[PDB]
Amino acid sequence: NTASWFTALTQHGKEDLKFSRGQGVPINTNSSPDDQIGYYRRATRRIRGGDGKMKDLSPRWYFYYLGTGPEAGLPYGANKDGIIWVATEGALNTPKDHIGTRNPANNAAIVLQLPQGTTLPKGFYAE
Ligand SMILES: [Cl-]
Numbered sequence: 001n002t003a004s005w006f007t008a009l010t011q012h013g014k015e016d017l018k019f020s021r022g023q024g025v026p027i028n029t030n031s032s033p034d035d036q037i038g039y040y041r042r043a044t045r046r047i048r049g050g051d052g053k054m055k056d057l058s059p060r061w062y063f064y065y066l067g068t069g070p071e072a073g074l075p076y077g078a079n080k081d082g083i084i085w086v087a088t089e090g091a092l093n094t095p096k097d098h099i100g101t102r103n104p105a106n107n108a109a110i111v112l113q114l115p116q117g118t119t120l121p122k123g124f125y126a127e
Contacts, residue, residue: 002069002100002101002102002103003101003102003103003104003109004062004063004064004069004101004102004109005026005028005063005064005065005099005101005102005107005109005110006026006028006062006063006109006110006111006112007109007110007111007112008043008060008061008062008112009040009060009061009063009112009124009125010058010059010060010061010124010125011042011058011059011060011061011123011124012058012123012124012125013121013122013123013124014123015121015122015123015124016042016084016121017040017042017061017084017120017121017124018084018121019084019086019118019119019120020119022087022088022089023086023088023114023115023117023118023119024040024086024114024118025037025038025063025086025087025088025091026063026110026112026113026114027113027114027115028110031065031099033088033090033091034090034091034092034094035065035091035092035096035099036087036088036090036091037065037066037076037086037087037088037091037092037093037096038063038064038065038066038068038085038086038087038096039063039064039066039069039071039074039076039083039084039085039086040061040062040063040064040083040084040086041061041062041064041069041070041071041082041083042059042060042061042082042083043059043060043061043062044056044057044059044060045057045060061084061124063086063112064101065096065099065100066087066093066094066095066096067094067095067096067097068095068096068097068099068100068101069101071083072095075093076093111127112127113126113127114126114127
């Protein structure tokens, strides 16, 4: 059982996460230009509120390299609710099994950083 290599982007507003073409891949100096491609997957947790009924928390969007993670089998551009795709110029459309996912027992998450000039929808924040 594994985890995203990066911390999540929390959705504070009504808009799903979306990036303009060529944007959205997190910075990771340990990966190469061919690897800069993947998807974000929405994870929506539920909690028992103060009243006593269940409710959704803010959705969290986690990045996974193409061909890894909970949707490792999906090809780039696959239509699936809660999955959005991103790729940098120069990336290769091949599975990134060599990067894989993170084992939290032996690796901390990488703080998710987006390069300068990256635009986001309302309610998401870039570090
Ligand atoms: Cl947050």
